[model samples]
Structures are given as C-alpha cells and as structure tokens.
Target chain A: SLISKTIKYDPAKDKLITLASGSFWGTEHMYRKYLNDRIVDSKVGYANGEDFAEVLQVSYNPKVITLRELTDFFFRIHDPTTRSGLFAHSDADLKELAKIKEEWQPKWGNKIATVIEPIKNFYDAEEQGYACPTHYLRE
Target chain B: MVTQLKSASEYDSALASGDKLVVVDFFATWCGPSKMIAPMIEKFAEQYSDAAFYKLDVDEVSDVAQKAEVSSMPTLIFYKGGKEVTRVVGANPAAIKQAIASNV
Candidate 1:
C-alpha cells in the first residue's frame, strides 16, 4: 500500500559540482550547514584520480546560488595545502574554477595546493549522517 | 498536526495504516537542529493532509531508533505499506518538503 517515488532535478535549474577536502562526510556536513535549502541533493563518491579519493557531489539550484560562491566557500572550509580539489562539471565551470584559484591564491599566501580539474570519474558511496560533528554534541 | 509518539506501540499504530504515507521524525531534545525544524514538520503535516505525521524522540524510543539505523537527530523517514521507502537526514526544510512532494 506504500507508494514509492524517485527524486529528479530539473536540468535547466539544477547543476552539480564535486569537492574533495579531508573526509567527504565533513565536507558534506559543512556544505549542508551553510547552503541548506539551496542544495537539491548531495552524495558521497570515490573519485578516480591517480589514487581513489573521496569526494562530495552536490546538486544545487544555480538560480539561487552561483558555483563561484560555492567555490569560495570550499576554500574557506578546509586547508588548501592538503589533498583538496574542485571538480568542474562543465568547461565554463572549469574556467571559473581556475579564475577562483587565481583570486584566492593571494589570500592563501600562495601555498595553496588545492587542484582545479575537469570532472573526474566517480563511484557512488553509501551516504551517512551519523558521524556529523555535532550529531552527538546536541544530545 | 504532527503527533508526538511516546512509545513503540504508538509508532507501530501510526504505521498500521499501510495505505497512508507515514512520515516519522526521529529527533532528540537537546538537538538544536531538531528543534529548529519541529515547526516545519508540523507545517508539512498540515500541507499534506493525506499523509500521517509522527515525531519520535530517539531517546524515548531507543529500540525503534536503533532498528531504523538512525545515527543522527532530525532524521526524517518516509514509510509506505509499513516499509521505509525513503529518508532525509538532517534538519533541512527544503529537502524535507521536496521529499514529501516527491512521494505524495
């Protein structure tokens, strides 16, 4: 008697971008906290680079927010000197990401190691919310 | 319109009507985000009159929470025919609204 359904995003309004910084769970939690209603959906995935890396794939309404704004927040959320990167979903996004890096580099003391790259092949991972930083703290 | 479920039997009774969509909020008293979205859940119950809505304190119903694999507060699970069909984790008003719209 239960009705089941699938969730879909309208292509004209929804867009996706992937970010990798430390653990995907932490990265995801941060985005969820800040972006909240703006994001449509998000998933954890293993990005196929030279080494398998965990990444957060987020879908959002570009009309409500810009990828550039998200890119800026990505830098603020984690240490750029570490294994952090941004994966662009389109060629336009690729250029925008490169530009963001150039602009952010000066503020980061030029020691930023975060890579800006074309979208990488990714394998989906099971999503989780239990490990969220404040999950237990609230109780 | 969201019913506060105090016991497992109450939860079971909510799920008994298989034809009705059951939306359960697994939350904690100390959780800030859980309380943040409490009113929003109530609003959804009002908006979706056909669906059944219930709120269960995870601390009060530890057995039910454990069985549902709920590791976080403000977790929203959608059940149909007494089986879980989908869920939205965290206190996201948009996601919860979208989930209800998608299923209902």
Candidate 2:
C-alpha cells in the first residue's frame, strides 16, 4: 500500500530546547522562515506547569550551531524585552537566569525577555503546536 | 479607580491591606496585546471602582509578576483575600469582563 525508502536517523543526540511565549509567542511558520537550515527539528508547545504558557522546542545539532547563536536567533525573532515569569527577571537575586541576563543585557539593553528554564512534565497542546521536517512532505 | 502598582512590596501591601476585590493586570510596555487591552482594564477599573484595580509592569515589578505566577504577558489575575480566585489571560475583552463579573 505504501512505498518508501528510509535513511538512518538517530534521535539520541538532540537537545530538548524550549522558549516561552505570551504576547508575541511565535508560530512554526516564523521559525521555519529563519531557522529551517540551522536546526535539526522544531515544535511549538507548552511550558509544563500550572501557568498556562506556550513555547517553541527545538532539536538542534550542537555541531551545527552553538547555544549562543541559537539564543541570539531566538532574540532576533521575538520580543525579549519583557519577562512574565515570577522570579526570572533581573540579576539582583542571584538566580542563574539573572546571571544570564547580567551577561547578555549590555548588548540588547534588556530587550531580551526570553527565559530558558528546565521544563518538567511537558503536556502537549491541542492541535496548536507542530513537529519537524515541517515544509515539503507535510507541505 | 485604576492604579499602577509600584513594586512587589507595594502589590503585597495592597493584598494585605485592601480587603475588597483586588484585580491586578499583569502587563508590560512592549507587549502589543497588553497595550490593546489597557483601555478595557482601565474601564473595568472605573466600572468596578469599589474593587481595587491595579496594573503591574512585568519589566518593572517582576517580583510581583513572580508572586502572582504570571507566565504570560497581560495576564489578569483576580485575587480575593490574598489568594487567587480566577483569571483571564491575554487580550480577549469578553473573557476579561466575564472574569470581572464572576469574581466580583
């Protein structure tokens, strides 16, 4: 009934990356527009907690792109000047996130509202998110 | 009347001191939807004048945003007697009014 030839692809080496969204959370179309080549795969989903939040998860090849570059691209695409999390703003309290802000803030003038936190219990959204190879075949 | 809360401590003082209905508009300067819903939130502040309506900038008073567990921009959290009762997130005016009526 189906005829297909497959190539070997291992799912082990990829990292589960996530970025939070509230007002200007991006769509899959946006990511596919800029990052179709650099990333191995991508998905738009939830942040996995009590708060109702959305995110973009990327499966990246570390060899292909550095975390800094990926993070830089993330800022380029979305408004990072605002943060909605309870305790993830400012470097005063000594949270690691704050430290990251301390490191990157000078260049961006605090326009980076993106929070990169560890996601526990990822519950998928109802048809609002997406998966990889997101263009032609599914296109 | 609508008020813009200054800091986390100030927001806390309101919850601890203001006994009536307390509605906080968790918002930011750059969020488009937050700006879009500003007039509505302000209108509700007048409509429900007895209830304390406050707007908090996530960029400024992030500590308060953290205390309210705001995960998104322009999240309206309704707190009664210093605890969460209900909420309406984002720019939907209808849902916000519904939350106002139901909670207040």
Candidate 3:
C-alpha cells in the first residue's frame, strides 16, 4: 500500500528576526499582541546549540525594527535567572548538561540558562489531534 | 527626502551596492505605530543626505518583507556595503539615532 502526503510552504520572501526566550507560548503571544502584525507567523523549535536546549523562533520585520530592540525584549519578557528547561518540566535536568557546558557557559553568565539565536530554519509541526484553551480563545 | 521604494528591485539593488547606505523603514498604512515613526525617519533622511532613506510598505512589498524575513512593523534596518548591519524594531527614536550614529 502507498500513502499520500500534503505539504505547505511559506513562499513569502519575508525578513526574519528569530527570538529565543524562556517560554514559547508567552513569546508568541507577546509578538502577536505588542509587535507588528507582520510578525504573523511563529513557531516553537529546539535550539540545539546550548547546554540546555530551548524552544525559540519568533520572526519579525527588520525594516520596521532593529536587532537591539529584539534582544531587549527577549531579556525583559522572560525570567532569565531560571535554570535551563525550567519553562517546561522535565525528568532529567542534566540530560544535555555536557552539551550545555561545552557551548553556553563561556558566552553567557550563570544567572540564566536560556539561549537566543537567529532563526536559520523553521520546521512547522505536523497536524495532530491536540487542543488548548488559549489557542481556541485567541483564535 | 523621504523616498518611496517603488519596487523590490530598487530595494535589493540599494542593499547590494555599497555606493549608498540604505535606511529602510518597514511600515503599514493602517499601523498607528508605523505612523508615529514615519515623520521621524523623514526628518532623519533630510538630516543625513549621505545615506539613502526609504519607506517600504509591508503590505505592498510583502515579497521584500518575506525576503528579509520581517515579522514586525515599524522596523528599521540599516544596510551598508549591501549588507545588513543594524536593525531596530518598534518605536524608539533615541535608539534609532544611536544606531545610525554608530554605523556612521
């Protein structure tokens, strides 16, 4: 037997400004509410380069805004002091400890475990049977 | 001195050639926040003739917006040597000035 699949792509040549912070949901809501409507698209993905990986990727306009402002927002909106993976509860805190130690400690202070990087690529999630009150209410 | 970017090709060429440093303000007609910074950018352009100042309508230049990956409005991007060096999101005149000054 053979299976059929459908794919969707964002062909728009939009400028992307990737933001990584503590919480994906909160960040998404913040951009949607406070920032430009051009920042209509958002996604949550694992930033693999840190000691503690994080969900990041909030794309925004470059012409209407600047990178410094985005950095300021990333710091202001989230509690950077919290430990890695604090936003999402996990059983093994040190699963990626060596990776974190190898890449993050030297660049950032010990006060926070979050990592922010530019959006290189974003993979949209597969459609699945999942629902949330916030998602429904906002939509 | 506010020059409207009539086409995406103009924008791409300006950004590609270092002959002029391009200062682009991404805005939407309906955005109040974009309106707030529009005049400031115009004045700044008048003050700084050495650079090219332009206004890009996000709605009209959706393709350009997508190329730059812009997700917000009232964003200001500074390009020199045909490469993006500085970017400012939202409305902050002081920061915008500082960004331009730093590049200059």
Candidate 4:
C-alpha cells in the first residue's frame, strides 16, 4: 500500500554491485574496512540457485570511487583466476566488467574463471542474534 | 578462567612449560567475529579444563600475533609442546571444539 525508498536508491549517484567471492565474511569485511568512505552499505547474500555462491552486495557512490577502480580492487581481493562470479545491475556495467576482465586476462592467463552475469534473485543471509557469526574473522 | 595475555613475557611463559594443549585465541576487540567467540571461549575454559586457554588482544600484543602468524582475528591456535600443532582460522565453533578434543 505504500511506496518504499528501497524501491530505488538514487541510481544517479549511488550504485549497487554484487561480488561473488569465496566467502561473504572476508569479502564484506575487507571491502568495508579498505573502502570505508566510498561504500554506502553492504550485505551478504546468496545468488541464483544454479551454482549458489556466497555474494557480497555492496552499495557505493560512483563519484568517490570509479567502477574501474572498484572492479580492479575486486580482482586484487580475491584470486580472479579462480573466482566465483560477478553481478552487474546494468548492461553497461556488465559490459564494462567484461572489458575489465579482459584487461586483466594477460596477467591471469585464459584460465580466469570469474563469470560476469546480470543481477538475479539474491536472498540476504539470515541474521543471527549478534550479526553474522563469522563476518569479521579475517580481521 | 581464560587468562588474557597482556605482555609478550606472559605469552612466552604460558607456552614454555605447559604439557597440556595450549590454545591461544588471537583476537581484536574491534572485530565482530572476535566478540562473538569471546563468550564461547569462556565456556570452553570450563568444558576443556584439561587444556589451557589463553587469550591475547592483537592490538595489545602485536608482536606475539605476528610471531604466531595470525593473519586473521579469532584464530584458535593449538600448541602441544612449545610448537604450534594446528589452527582454526575463524570463529568456527565445531572446528575449535574438535581441535581441543583431538589435541587434548
């Protein structure tokens, strides 16, 4: 009956990107700590039931950090050559990610397993009494 | 009681003479996972009386943390003499219990 702000949060300034890394715990922690100011928020979730990997849904201000820089940081954080996947909200972002992946292909060779796909049904991880059980393990 | 190591000397002393399995939890106060496991480790002190449970804040004892190779917070390192046997590198309760069981 009511329109929610969650429907769309200022797409012009704020953007959401999902990084499917090895563990949502470390991935979220590392990004939150390193890219603190630029990052608006982040949530750990599971993506489309196909290969169902742990994903980190991150919200950021593009003005603070560029998509290229953020994507590059993604590659630095986890081994992209043996990574899980990536979720882009827009076709432009998806194409951009593909180009970025190719840019790093020479260093990682052709065996890079990181997949770039459009966003799908992402279910947030169930919360416990005191936050996620192992969210900051790699501190 | 879980003895909180305040100094490097205290850390060295604990590992020097204990025949019982010495379990050291390398944690940071700011870390969420470390806070979550703190209470569970206190219970471990009661359950695993045979072994020694010691804690050290990475912030306070950075030297020891570095020496122990603790790249992560809430890392449970099991030492059987003076040398480290194994470690569970997260806030994994099952692995922590199993490590205590097998090592002790």
Candidate 5:
C-alpha cells in the first residue's frame, strides 16, 4: 500500500506499479505553481515525473479521492489526450484508464497517441528489457 | 502541514472556517519531490508556524484533491479564510516559501 508515514514502505506490500505519461515541467510544474501551493493543509505532492512516460505505484483513498476523479485529473493534467506520450501497464485496469483517456480527448482532431499495452511483469527490470525509470530517480 | 488531516471532508471543513493561513502539500510515495521537498517543508513548517500546514497523500485522500482541482503530485496549495490563495506545484523551496510569505 502506498500509504507512507502510517503504513510506511515495505517492498513486499508496496511493490505495485501503475503506468502513465507527459511533459514533467509543463504538467507537474504548473500544477505545483497554481493548484497545490494554494492549500495550507499539506494537501498534495509528486513522486517522480521528470520523464514524459513512466510507471506509477500508489495506493489511493477511494472514500475521498474516487477512481473516477483521479483518472479524470490524470488525463486532463497530462497528455493522455495527445496522440503520443502516454502508456499504461498491462496489469492495471486499462478500460478504466482508457475511459478517462477518451474523456479527455478532442479526438474530433482524431488523435490521442497513447499506447495501452501491458507492462512487463516486474521480476527484474533488466530481464524485462526496458529499463525501469526508477533506477535513475530512486530517492 | 502537521495539522492532523485525513479525509477530504476533514480538510474541507478546516479550510472552510477560512480564518487562518493554511498550507497543503499534495504528494505521493515513490515520487522524488515528496522525499526531497519534504524536508524543506518540515523545516519551514516550524519556522512558519504562523500559518497552518498539512500534508495530503494524493494516493490516499484524492477526493479533497479532486475538489481542490489538484492534478499533479507534489503540488502545494496555500489558503487563507477558507479559500485558496495561490499554489506551487513540484518541490520548489523558493516558490513555496514565497507563496506562503505572501499570504501569511
């Protein structure tokens, strides 16, 4: 469970991964600049977003933050609507992710180049072939 | 901000009173800024005790996050009188402090 401070981080418990995308600076930067910094309650923050395409592992509070809301925001904030710069892991709920993807599309322009492929099983990043973005930015 | 926050309603009500300066940090685990920028917040939280500070896990309490319209992680939301004053997303120490100082 991605619940730190309370649950803390345990590899066995918190090793789940979800996939995602976009321009880190424009997407994440503006979010910080405008939306988050306004709340005085230690409201929100980021994990890793330097790369445009990366996998995310997090545990969300469904009671308060619904899947629908998170998915909607994810698409709106990033480039899920774009023809490219988007990817989702095979293990995750792609239909849910895709629904949100479509929700953000102006595809009347006919685009949203996201690749909804399954992510390789995470036994070893090297064995899987593509280097996990985690290596470069592990805190 | 160590203001003991959990659910979206809890935060919303607190912000609703709209009396004091409030600072919210929207973050998630596995993200770089939450770790790197967290310390700055810790240090500053004490220094700037005049304003209220709280941390919301985007992965945890996303309902309040959605209400606030926070899309990205490591986003910092500043508040006063139960209304959002301004924001700073990502792990920006300078901007975070600047935004806080401006309001408080």
Candidate 6:
C-alpha cells in the first residue's frame, strides 16, 4: 500500500496548539470550560505520524495563554496509566507502552504515563463533528 | 527519485515542457488520506521513473492548489503534453494507478 504524505500544518493560524493525547470528547469539554475565554476554537481530529490516533487542535489567543499552561493541562487532566485510550472510552489500546514510558516518564518525572507531544498534523473528522457546550443547547 | 515543486511558476514551467507524462501530487504533511496514498505514488514514480513524478506541497504553494481547485490533500493530477487529462481526489491507490495508466 502506497501511503501518501501530507505537510501537517496549514491555514497558518498563529499561536495554534496541536496536541495529541487521547479521546476528543473529554478534551473538548475540559478546554471549553476551564481554559481561557480566548480559547475560541477546538477541533477533534486524528494526528498523522502515529498509527491513526485521535488528536485535538486548540486555536487560542496566545496573549491570554501560554504553551506551558497548555502542556500542564495536557498532563494533569488525563491519566497516563491506562494502556487504552485516554478516558478509557474504548478497549482498543494499540499505543506503544514502552515508547510512552521512555518519553513521558523520564522527562516529566511524574506518575504521568500519557504521551504528550506537540501536534504535527491534525486530520479533522468530518463525521464525528465538534462537540462543545457553546454549540450545544444548555439544559 | 522525486523533485519538489519549489514554486507555482516552476510547476507551470514543468507542465509547459511536456517532455514526459507528469504526475503532480498536491499534498500536505498532516493529511491522513494523503499519507495513505503517498507510498503508492512513490512506488509508481519509481516503476515509471522515465515519466516525471513531481510533488507539490499545498501548504507552500497555495497558489497552485487554488489554480487546480485543490480542496483536499493528496490530489493527483495527471498531465500529458502540458495539459491536464484527469484528476483524482483523496487516497485511492487503485484509482490513481488507473488514471496514470489510462492517461499516460
């Protein structure tokens, strides 16, 4: 199978943060509420260079936020222990356990087991769609 | 071997030359669908090295993408004699091969 390669970042939107964690649903919810109001847009998609893993894109106002804070939120909010997807939503845990240990553990020096890295490319899921409280009708 | 299309003008010039059946791939680094078909494009280029296999980065050359009306990544356009004969959108390896074989 000939796999096509695409340059990951386009749109040239400044100060955009591409983060590959796990699970779109929870990440969307957390960012919409806890993050700065300037965190205007969040997209749920898949990041390439990995085996078709889910990812999120946060287009934020850099003036209102910083990469360190985003990194902190990424590590703190999600549990790195579970071998499965971040939120334990599904059973298919295809992630490399050893890779996760080497990259995340020694660097962060925390119990954090999740792999957190700057997003290289984000492929938006046209079907799953974006789920945000602002878009949804509040009860 | 593959040559990167540095600018939109260079792409135009390549088309004008019409020396070989050209396969121009408009792609992005992060597009999954594009990645899926990239390897096949490379193999096809190698198998048919006599023909020119050109790669264009959509992120870098938005002008060319717009000229071609490329809405998505991994858009394969087949050019014969400096004219576009056919185009395939997304990552269908079979379709791409067919397009190249039929046109070129």
Clashing pairs in 1: none
- Which tens-of-lDDT digit does each residue in B33-104 have in candidate 3? 566788888778877778888889866877787688665567889998988898988767778888877776
Per residue, candidate 5 scores C-alpha lDDT tens digits across B1-104 of 47646897788877875567988877665466555677888877988878878888765776787788775557788888888879987677998889988887
Candidate 4's TM-score on the B chain: 0.95
Clashes of 6: 20
Residue B60 shift from truth in candidate 2, angstroms:
0.6
Error at A132, model 6, angstroms: 22
Error of 6 at A34 (Å): 18
The DockQ figures for the candidates are 0.05, 0.03, 0.01, 0.19, 0.02, 0.01
Estimate, for each residue in B1-104, the C-alpha lDDT of model 4 and write its tens digit.
Answer: 89899999999889885688998988866566777898888888899989899999876887898788775678888887788999987787877888898988
Task: Score chain B of each candidate by TM-score.
Answer: 0.96, 0.91, 0.92, 0.95, 0.90, 0.91
Q: What is the interface RMSD of candidate 4, in Å?
A: 6.3
True contacts kept of 6: 0.00
TM-score of chain A of 6: 0.55
Q: Which candidate model has the greater TM-score, 1 or 4?
A: 4
Which parts of model 2 have CA positions greater than 4 angstroms off? A1-139
TM-score per candidate for chain A alone = 0.80, 0.60, 0.47, 0.78, 0.44, 0.55
lDDT of 4 by residue, A61-109 (tens): 8888778987888777655553358888888998999999999887676
User: What local lDDT does model 6 show for residue A19?
Assistant: 51
Report the candidate with higher TM-score, 2 versus 4. Answer: 4
For model 1, the DockQ equals 0.05
Worst 10 residues of 3 chain B by lDDT: B27-36
Q: What is the TM-score of chain B in candidate 5?
A: 0.90
Candidate 3: where are CA atoms >4 Å away? A1-139
